[PDB]
Amino acid sequence: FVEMVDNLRGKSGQGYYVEMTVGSPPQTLNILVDTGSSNFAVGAAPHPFLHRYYQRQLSSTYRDLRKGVYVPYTQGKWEGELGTDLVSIPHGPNVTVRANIAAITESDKFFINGSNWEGILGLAYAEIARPDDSLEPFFDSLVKQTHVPNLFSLQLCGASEVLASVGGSMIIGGIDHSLYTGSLWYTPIRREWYYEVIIVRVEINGQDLKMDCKEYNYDKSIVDSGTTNLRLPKKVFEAAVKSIKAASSTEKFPDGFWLGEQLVCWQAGTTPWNIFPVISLYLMGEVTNQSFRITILPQQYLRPVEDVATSQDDCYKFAISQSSTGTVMGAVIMEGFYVVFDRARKRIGFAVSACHVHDEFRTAAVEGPFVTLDMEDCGYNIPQTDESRSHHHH
Numbered sequence: 548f549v550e551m552v553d554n555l556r557g558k559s560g561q562g563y564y565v566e567m568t569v570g571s572p573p574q575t576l577n578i579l580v581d582t583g584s585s586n587f588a589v590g591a592a593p594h595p596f597l598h599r600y601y602q603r604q605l606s607s608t609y610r611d612l613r614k615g616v617y618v619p620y621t622q623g624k625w626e627g628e629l630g631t632d633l634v635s636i637p638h639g640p641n642v643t644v645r646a647n648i649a650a651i652t653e654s655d656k657f658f659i660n661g662s663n664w665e666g667i668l669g670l671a672y673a674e675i676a677r678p679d680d681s682l683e684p685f686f687d688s689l690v691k692q693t694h695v696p697n698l699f700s701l702q703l704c705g706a707s708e709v710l711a712s713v714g715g716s717m718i719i720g721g722i723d724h725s726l727y728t729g730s731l732w733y734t735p736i737r738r739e740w741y742y743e744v745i746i747v748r749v750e751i752n753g754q755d756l757k758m759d760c761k762e763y764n765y766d767k768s769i770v771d772s773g774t775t776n777l778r779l780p781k782k783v784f785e786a787a788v789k790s791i792k793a794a795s796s797t798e799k800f801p802d803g804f805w806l807g808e809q810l811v812c813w814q815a816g817t818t819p820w821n822i823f824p825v826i827s828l829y830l831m832g833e834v835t836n837q838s839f840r841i842t843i844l845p846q847q848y849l850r851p852v853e854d855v856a857t858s859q860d861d862c863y864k865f866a867i868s869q870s871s872t873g874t875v876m877g878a879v880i881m882e883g884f885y886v887v888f889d890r891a892r893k894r895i896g897f898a899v900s901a902c903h904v905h906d907e908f909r910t911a912a913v914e915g916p917f918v919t920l921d922m923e924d925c926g927y928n929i930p931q932t933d934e935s936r937s938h939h940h941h
């Protein structure tokens with residue numbers, strides 16, 4: 548797996564990408580690693596934010612599927628033509644797969660200016676693939692066509708004119724022991740669609756938020772490398788900000804900071820990290836009535852941003868935000884840990900990353916077990932729409 552170490556790069560807040568090749572001869576593209584979607588989609592037409600794009604015409608191995616694909620999401624949209632081609636990960640397993648590729652022809656607020664990526668690798672399940680669940684995702688094709696074990700793991704490492712460079716590792720088909728210390732704790736994958744999990748308790752500086760645990764998973768909780776922030780449901784976000792405000796009260800920040808629309812600065816190397824509390828998310832254990840906690844530092848949820856004007860100061864953005872689509876454990880969360888997407892055993896493993904950002908006084912932690920007698924079900928059951936109900940699965 549040494550060949551796979553440091554195979555991820557990117558700019559802070561703009562996503563982690565892996566180099567991939569598509570077609571014959573191979574066209575190289577930088578592809579966003581996204582555990583919150585299930586399509587392999589690449590820029591395939593000019594766009595002002597793309598240096599390069601996939602040219603289907605240059606590939607002798609390209610097969611058109613003669614089917615379009617339209618993908619609107621909250622903040623934007625992408626669309627294109629479906630087809631198949633030969634795909635490889637140069638700094639991944641020494642294999643070539645025939646995979647589905649959505650050739651992006653038009654997009655709205657999808658590509659990020661300066662991100663250095665031209666496509667997306669959707670690593671989640673067939674259930675959330677577009678147009679439908681018959682469009683086999685890349686990982687499923689990789690496992691079906693090769694002898695690669697059904698598991699991948701992610702070590703995302705966090706960091707005037709440009710944004711800070713980030714690095715990381717995507718280990719396909721295994722767990723690399725030099726990327727983590729201590730024990731690996733597993734939480735069940737609730738359902739194979741997103742990488743959905745269950746949060747049973749939330750503590751801010753060791754103080755329980757005391758909400759009914761279904762609120763933490765309303766309407767779902769997912770592990771998403773494709774989202775930067777820790778995103779929390781409205782009521783949970785409000786309680787969290789109130790508690791983080793209380794523990795950091797000595798300093799009064801503008802309302803824009805808590806909304807993530809304004810930076811707060813301190814003289815270089817003088818950031819008072821100690822006034823910022825740790826956040827502990829307790830995840831359901833493999834054993835009924837057990838949980839383990841993942842502990843995140845302010846170094847993870849206060850994202851560093853270099854101000855061109857005040858370069859003599861350390862400036863940060865609050866990287867916890869409100870959600871109306873449930874909890875999103877984005878890169879802010881993942882950056883503290885080595886995360887194991889054990890699809891074969893339908894579970895997600897967390898261990899302390901060998902690369903997380905920390906101080907001499909506190910560390911990001913993975914600790915357990917924590918036991919609860921007569922535990923209520925913390926999972927939320929999404930209201931069934933007539934549309935979802937009508938669907939047939941053969």
Ligand SMILES: NC1=N[C@@]2(c3ccc(F)cc3F)COCC[C@H]2CS1
Nearest residue numbers: 562581583584620657659771773774
């Ligand atoms: N995890 C996510 N993945 C998507 C995404 C990530 C990063 C990005 F830069 C653009 C995007 F469109 C791609 O799949 C559809 C939903 C959106 C938003 S959240």
